[PDB]
């Protein structure tokens with residue numbers, strides 16, 4: 001159907017869920033498994049890095065967005081389009097968008113709003129793939145991401 005979308009959702013949804021709960025998903029990765037695994041290993045290193053290095057900036061943004069429920073998560077979409085989509089495009093901003101997803105997902109787990117983590121992952125994947133389709137394709141998608149951060 002749309003392999004780039006499917007693979008993107010798989011990687012982003014797994015990272016966000018693993019960050020929120022601490023459990024690594026052992027259910028085998030779907031089509032192009034070698035790439036999705038390396039992509040997720042890359043996020044574990046670079047994404048954990050951005051969250052640790054920029055905790056204060058991440059925390060201040062979470063505080064502005066005041067996420068309390070499903071409604072607040074739905075309104076993050078408009079913000080991500082304005083903040084992410086309207087800026088320059090590059091793997092460093094893509095990793096920042098996804099890392100901030102993880103930081104929000106951990107927040108959702110603490111406040112007993114885990115049911116919002118899957119929707120969040122879908123919203124981030126939709127923002128990324130809908131708005132950066134041609135750039136992702138030109139940069140060889142998730143193979144490119146993995147090669148970029150080696």
Ligand SMILES: CCc1sc2ncnc(N[C@H](Cc3ccccc3)C(=O)O)c2c1-c1ccccc1C
Pocket residue numbers: 054057058061079080083084087093094096097100
């Ligand atoms: C809605 C929140 C989002 S989505 C997003 N996507 C890409 N980059 C972001 N941020 C980087 C700056 C940057 C780099 C590293 C750490 C912190 C902040 C960019 O704008 O270059 C952002 C931000 C965002 C914007 C401002 C403050 C905090 C965040 C999370």
